[PDB]
Amino acid sequence: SLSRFVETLVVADDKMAAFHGAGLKRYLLTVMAAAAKAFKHPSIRNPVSLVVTRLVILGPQVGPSAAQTLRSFCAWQRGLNTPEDSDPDHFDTAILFTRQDLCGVSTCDTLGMADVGTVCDPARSCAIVEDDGLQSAFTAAHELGHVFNMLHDNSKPCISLNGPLSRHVMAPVMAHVDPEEPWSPCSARFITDFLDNGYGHCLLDKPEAPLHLP
Ligand SMILES: Cn1ccnc1[C@]1(CNC(=O)c2cc3cc(Cl)ccc3o2)NC(=O)NC1=O
Ligand SMILES: [Ca+2]
Ligand SMILES: [Ca+2]
Ligand SMILES: [Ca+2]
Ligand SMILES: [Zn+2]
């Protein structure tokens, strides 16, 4: 039942600034509002409030390898944070949007990357998103699902939890997301356990000065 608030640092690279220009801040808050709406959907079972508290427009090394862009960004974002959650400048997770075509080992179909189950570890609570211009909120929600310890819905543990009957955020590839069920039962279970085990202990304080859309 506890309200959970994820104090979020949103970062946009030079490519995002070059393309969106003056409309970038509004764009990022719109994307994040949409991701936040996903995280309040009842299907998640333990809803959380994704709150933008800091917004940086650019830094870290951004290139084709998603793995090394994520590692670079995650090292870089540490520097902006503060040691204690009591500090207003402290943030719980860092998310980077870039126009760089991010790639895996064999193709560039990837749209983002995050390490799994890291949300209250400031050294590790990181995600990167390739901005496609239309579905970026869904990619952000997928990466943030991983940060909240979620697996893909075609994983073995998820088959048992979902049943037998690709329409959710944690599908392995983007497909059309069910508006009545953005999160599978597997997704809800994994975030619920993560929080029940005390891994969301940094999500309990309420942010001071959230950034709001007009
Ligand atoms: C880790 N990795 C390594 C190689 N490729 C990856 C992937 C690829 N998938 C995506 O980029 C991506 C975006 C998206 C949005 C929706 Cl709604 C549903 C599914 C989605 O998948 N990155 C990731 O986060 N998981 C992966 O398998
Ligand atoms: Ca705080
Ligand atoms: Ca890509
Ligand atoms: Ca916090
Ligand atoms: Zn994934």
UniProtKB/Swiss-Prot annotation:
Zn(2+) binds at residues 142, 146, 152. Disulfide bonds join 74-126, 103-108, 120-202, 158-186. Expressed in brain, lung and heart. Expressed at very low level in placenta and skeletal muscles. Isoform 2: Detected in osteoarthritic synovium. It comes from the Eukaryota. The active site is at 143. The precursor is cleaved by a furin endopeptidase. Glycosylated. Can be O-fucosylated by POFUT2 on a serine or a threonine residue found within the consensus sequence C1-X(2)-(S/T)-C2-G of the TSP type-1 repeat domains where C1 and C2 are the first and second cysteine residue of the repeat, respectively. Fucosylated repeats can then be further glycosylated by the addition of a beta-1,3-glucose residue by the glucosyltransferase, B3GALTL. Fucosylation mediates the efficient secretion of ADAMTS family members. It is found in: Secreted, Extracellular space, Extracellular matrix. Residues 4-207 form the Peptidase M12B domain. Induction: By IL1/interleukin-1. The spacer domain and the TSP type-1 domains are important for a tight interaction with the extracellular matrix. The spacer domain is also required for cleavage of COMP. The conserved cysteine present in the cysteine-switch motif binds the catalytic zinc ion, thus inhibiting the enzyme. The dissociation of the cysteine from the zinc ion upon the activation-peptide release activates the enzyme. Interacts with SRPX2. Cleaves aggrecan, a cartilage proteoglycan, at the '392-Glu-|-Ala-393' site and may be involved in its turnover. Also cleaves COMP. May play an important role in the destruction of aggrecan in arthritic diseases. Could be a critical factor in the exacerbation of neurodegeneration in Alzheimer disease. This is A disintegrin and metalloproteinase with thrombospondin motifs 4.
